[PDB]
């Protein structure tokens, strides 16, 4: 369950700010890049202080695996990036795989929208988007530190030469691009 994360968030993340939540989502995108599948990772800091991370990798698995009765993506989000889900007022996950666009959404660590096919796309159009709204009640400050995000993303870009990383800050109206 995710209740224990909500009871003691500081046992699971840096509760100073939601930056570490951001890093966890970023790490998963970067992993797809390191695995050789993603060529671009975009991060967007929205005006409402929610963070959105998108990669053009293979897309999180949406199928139901033998043994499991629930879509892989749901397990990934709910089975203890599940910490991000636990500590967010809302999380929206969208996946492009197999020429279909899939959506699923959570609030307060609980699913509020079943995995649903909501569109179609090119066969080569693949990737994962995670957009989350941290619950301010778990953090000393709800504000993402922009400098900390930039240090992190510069660090990831150098770790993955050839992968493009972008950061769009819709609060301060800047965009940065790295590609080493
Ligand atoms: C915005 C965060 N990005 C992200 O989570 N990307 C991403 N995350 C994943 C994962 C998991 C487990 O998180 C698995 C596969 C994957 C692995 C094997 C075959 N097909 C897809 C692909 C992925 N791509």
Note whether 74 and 63 are within 8 A (CB): no
Cβ contacts of 150-155, under 8 Å, gap ≥ 24: 150/176, 152/19, 152/22, 152/23, 152/26, 153/26, 153/43, 153/178, 154/178
Atom of ligand 1 nearest to the CA of 29: 3
Buried (b) or exposed (e) across 143-177, using 16+ Cβ within 10 A? ebebebbbebbeebbeebeebbbbbebeeeeeebe
Cβ atoms < 10 Å from Cβ of 38? 23
What method did the depositors use to determine the structure?
X-ray
Ligand 1 centroid – CA 140 distance (Å): 30
Cβ atoms < 10 Å from Cβ of 68? 12
**130 φ/ψ angles, rounded to the nearest 5 degrees:** -125, 125
Mutation probe of ligand 1 site: the residue of 42, 60, 78 with most atoms within 8 A of C-beta: 60
Q: How many CA atoms, within 13 angstroms, populate the side-chain half-sphere of residue 169?
A: 16
The position carrying tokens 């504000």 is: 143
Cβ atoms < 10 Å from Cβ of 19? 24
Atom of ligand 1 nearest to the CA of 61: 21
Q: How many CA atoms, within 13 angstroms, populate the side-chain half-sphere of residue 11?
A: 9
Note whether 45 and 171 are within 8 A (CB): yes
What is the spatial distance between Cα 77 and Cα 109, in angstroms, rounded to a whole number? 9
Name the residue with the closest Cα to ligand 1, atom 18: 61
Residues 6+ apart with CB under 8 A from 47: 170, 171
CATH match of 1-180 with 3.20.20.70: no
Cβ atoms < 10 Å from Cβ of 78? 17
**64 φ/ψ angles, rounded to the nearest 5 degrees:** -90, 120
What is the spatial distance between Cα 134 and Cα 19, in angstroms, rounded to a whole number? 10
What is the spatial distance between Cα 118 and Cα 100, in angstroms, rounded to a whole number? 8
What is the spatial distance between Cα 67 and Cα 76, in angstroms, rounded to a whole number? 15
Instruction: List the chain domain ranges.
Output: 1-180
Overall resolution, Å: 1.8
Name the residue among 74, 59, 66, 69 with its Cα closest to residue 116. 74
What is the spatial distance between Cα 158 and Cα 171, in angstroms, rounded to a whole number? 26
Element (H, E) at 146: helix 146-159
DSSP letter, residue 136: G
Q: Is 172 helix (H, G, I), strand (E, B) or coil?
A: coil
């Amino acid at each position: 369950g995710l209740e224990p994360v909500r009871r003691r968030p500081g046992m699971y993340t840096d509760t100073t700010r939601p930056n570490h939540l951001g890093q966890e989502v970023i790490d998963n995108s970067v992993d797809e890049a390191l695995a050789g599948h993603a060529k671009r990772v975009d991060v967007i800091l929205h005006a409402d202080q929610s963070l959105e991370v998108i990669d053009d990798g293979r897309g999180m698995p949406v199928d139901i695996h033998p043994e499991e009765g629930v879509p892989a993506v749901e397990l990934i989000l709910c089975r203890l990036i599940s910490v991000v889900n636990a500590l967010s007022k809302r999380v929206e996950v969208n996946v492009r795989r197999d020429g279909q666009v899939y959506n699923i959404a959570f609030e307060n660590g609980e699913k509020v929208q079943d995995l649903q096919v909501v569109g179609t796309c090119g066969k080569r159009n693949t990737g994962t988007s995670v957009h989350f709204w941290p619950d301010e009640t778990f953090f000393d400050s709800p504000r993402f530190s922009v400098s900390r995000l930039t240090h992190v993303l510069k660090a990831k870009a150098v770790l993955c030469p050839g992968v493009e990383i972008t950061f769009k800050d819709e609060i301060n109206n800047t965009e940065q691009r790295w590609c080493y």
